[PDB]
């Protein structure tokens, strides 16, 4: 596997990749998000938020309450391993995190915390083996 991944998000509330594998050789990992659509953030912004799979809904719910100016992620949320900014069509963002935060054998989710999107925009991240 690799030490970065790129995920595209679009105007139909989809990510183009459903699984990311972090190579065991990596100390850090970078997630690149592209918004390949034409909708504005007000309507159809997207981010990428990485959590333990069990924490997805709780983080998304707290994120809605945080608002767009907080990238729809609660400030200081200890359940968030990493997140990007919310972007609109024609934009991109990236975030890097320490792979020591990812444990072998655990299930992680990456998802969009823009209101309503997590039900459609979610994949799995795991540490390779
Ligand atoms: Cu989204």
Swiss-Prot record:
Name of the protein described by the UniProt record: Azurin-2
Taxonomic path: Bacteria, Pseudomonadati, Pseudomonadota, Betaproteobacteria, Burkholderiales
Claim: Disulfide bond is one of the keywords in the record: yes
Domain Plastocyanin-like residue range list: 1-129
Places the protein is found: Periplasm
Cysteine disulfide links: 3-26
One Pfam family named in its UniProt record: Copper-bind
This protein's GO CC annotations: periplasmic space
Keywords: Copper, Disulfide bond, Electron transport, Metal-binding, Periplasm, Transport
GO molecular function: copper ion binding; electron transfer activity
Cited NCBIfam families: azurin
Protein function: Transfers electrons from cytochrome c551 to cytochrome oxidase.
CDD domains with a match to the protein in the record: Azurin (cd13922)
Positions contributing to Cu cation binding: 46, 112, 117, 121
Keyword Electron transport set for record: yes
Source superkingdom: Bacteria
InterPro entries registered for this protein in UniProt: Azurin (IPR014068), BlueCu_1 (IPR000923), BlueCu_1_BS (IPR028871), Cu-binding_ET (IPR050845), Cupredoxin (IPR008972)
């Amino acid at each position: 596997a690799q030490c970065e991944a790129t995920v595209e998000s679009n105007d139909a509330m989809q990510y183009n990749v459903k699984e990311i594998v972090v190579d065991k050789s990596c100390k850090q990992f970078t997630m690149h998000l592209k918004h390949v659509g034409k909708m504005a953030k007000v309507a159809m912004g997207h981010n990428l938020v990485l959590t333990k799979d069990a924490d997805k809904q709780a983080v998304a719910t707290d994120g809605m309450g945080a608002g767009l100016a907080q990238d729809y992620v609660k400030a200081g949320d200890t359940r968030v391993i990493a997140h990007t900014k919310v972007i609109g069509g024609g934009e991109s963002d990236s975030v890097t995190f320490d792979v020591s935060k990812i444990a072998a054998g655990e299930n992680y989710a990456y998802f969009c915390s823009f209101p309503g999107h997590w039900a459609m925009m979610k994949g799995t991240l795991k540490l390779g083996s």
